[PDB]
């Protein structure tokens, strides 16, 4: 009877030629680091507590590839800290002298140039979950403010 | 009392003469399908795993209408595949020989002419959510690339 | 003294005109089914072991209504299997030729159209628990993969 | 090495002499109100349900100002309805006898002359968010159609 | 070997100059209130059962501050009901004549203006948990519909 | 069958001989920086917080090129600061003693002569995203006003 205009639906995805496929929940995910105190980030080299996040690989075929690694890409805080991600929320109110570090399963920070891959993880058939950690890294006396950062990752299958 | 120009706000919506009103989160929504492998789309008729998405109807009045169906409208991939969405990302980097299928609650792919409505769903008073699925449909050997599509829908009340 | 921006809280709920109200722990819930072997779903019509889940009704008034029934609404796997839920997780890595069946308190699989309600259960004043079961149903030789599914339910009072 | 013309980037922003700075997300935001039924706007004074939106203030310094208020500027629907936004999308297809009201944190509709400010909110150092609501206001029997509106705002720091 | 595009990760957090830091789970959290009957909200001042939620403070240093209090900020439902939240789901389908009240650990409803703080709770070193309650408050005869509300909070340390 | 003149459609594009093609969403993009306080740009060398923006590359073929770099072109603020974009919106209302800097993924401001390319990023097949940041740079005591700027970019595939 009564027909009414509704709305629109936008579909996002990607076709890849690879052993696995990144899960829909891992392609674009938000990691809540929570609040941190300036007293913790008092001087250069100070780190906060870590927050874990995962990249889940679906439909993995170990015949095609048995190892998977992840390289992250983003804007570094400066030239002397190539593994510290810079904060980019807005033009005002961001924290100063602090950035975000991404750790792979070996506990070491990853270079954010998109070429340095993480430690390879052996894959099984089906679902695979690559663990990662995120934490704040102080490049000096940290200043209060928002600390939001963004990075892209690419997966290597061997 | 320092007064400062702040910005601007744009309001979007629609007044409809219908038994239900589409929810604000369903009028415009993004469905993340995730990555898919070319090995799963190696020949015509090959489909992917489905991703669900809902259209929520608010303030439903069963005295006005008891059923609700949804018809989708979009660009078809071919003349013989009138139920497969074509991809619309950009002029480069898009996947080939693959499209998006919208499944109603019966599991059948809907025609995207804007006139073939879904299987009717009985409505209660108040909130109603109509389920749908999206999956990739291969029209041949799929090529790697971005797979983004979008469609509009209209709701019929009987 | 030192005041700091803390965060945000989101409140979700619903006001209904009904004899009972669904408990906050039953409006949305995750039912863990566990793993299942493909050897137990080797042909069409094969079913797995059942996992139980409950919908709790609070503040029931027997004067207003004495019996409660539940209907479930979700995407069906096929047109010949209108009582089998379709898997819904992501675009890659989900199991094929297998779905999820919801059983009412009589053991019969419920149709997922949202208009065929379960067996009516007599209610008492206050808390009421309506039992349900979920299991995997094979529409053929099932393949390995993720087996997630979602469905919404309606409550009818007489 | 192949050098190719890429494109253009446009940067928008504003320098202010104020205690706070409006966040980049609050400078130009779209508020999706969703659909509304005509039966909910059948006579003058009938309002719809509200949709919330925020204006975020960054880098707030309470030593400069401790309170913040917001005034909105837009085209009113009528002379006697100075707190109802007139709809403006195109020359055809718009709804009639209905507009948009902006409610401050006290729940009162704001006058849209750009001089009547909202209730002041105490500010803390750093990030501050000011809650607002939007709803449809009917000046008569609402007619179906598009219901888009636009309003600019300014922030007063005391 | 084979390298493919993955996805993107968004990190969200905040650096604060405070005695404690709000936990990652408390910065954003959804409180599920469940359903409520209209019969329990039949007149002004009628309240539903409370649902508990708590804000967790981490890395607390009792030398810096010994007590913490919370003030909530949201859109009030009326001028005479400053301690009752207003619903914000969509333009249609929301309940009328009912809001959300946030109760302190002393059982008193908090004023939603961001300046009236809760009762101070003495802090210990390490993890601290501030309990709160949420309930429905009726300003009249409540109407069936969705009841969703949003509130932001700030923490005071002294 | 009533036929009516409808309107006109303009198509903008470019054919390039390169390993990658710039995505339609990044050929002409608007970067909303937000607001900034004059107190944060009080003296020469003071910078604001950064805002991130990306240039997406499509249909990348690593057999043709494996590295990509971006150079930006625009009017500098003066001869001393060749890496600061001058502001341009109109004859009146622009901010004084402040410009816009573009940071590459290494966090270093780029020279705006159209020939100093950014740090090379390793490319994968298909979609590639090169990160960038924008921030305000004070050449003295900044004056309130509009702070819009425009720059073009070119991509070098080596």
Residue numbers in the entry:
A (entry chain D), B (entry chain C), C (entry chain F), D (entry chain B), E (entry chain E), F (entry chain A): 2 to 159
Sentences from the paper on this structure:
Type 1 pili are important virulence factors of uropathogenic Escherichia coli that mediate bacterial attachment to epithelial cells in the urinary tract. All subunits in the rod are connected via DSE, forming an exceptionally stable fold that is resistant to extreme temperatures, denaturants and mechanical stress.
To investigate whether FimD is responsible for the increased stability of in vivo-assembled pili, we assembled FimD-catalysed pili in vitro (hereafter denoted as FimD-cat) in a reaction where FimDCH was primed by the addition of FimC–FimF. The resulting unfolding half-lives (t½) at 6.45 M GdmCl showed that the FimD-cat pili (t½ = ~1700 s) were almost as stable as the in vivo-assembled pili (t½ = ~19,800 s) and significantly more stable than pili assembled in vitro (t½ = 26 s) at 6.45 M GdmCl. Moreover, the dependence of the unfolding half-life on GdmCl of FimD-cat pili also displayed the same characteristic kink at high GdmCl concentrations as that of in vivo-assembled pili (>6.75 M). The melting temperature of in vitro-assembled pili was significantly lower (59 °C) than for pilus samples assembled in vivo (79 °C) or in the presence of FimD (78 °C). Importantly, the stability of in vitro-assembled type 1 pilus rods can be restored to near-in vivo levels by the addition of FimD to the assembly reaction. We modelled six adjacent FimA subunits linked through donor-strand interactions and refined the models against their respective cryo-EM maps. The Cα root mean square deviation (RMSD) from global alignment of the three models was less than 1 Å in each case (0.68 Å, 0.69 Å and 0.25 Å for FimD-cat vs. in vivo, FimD-cat vs. in vitro and in vitro vs. in vivo, respectively) implying that all three structures are highly similar.
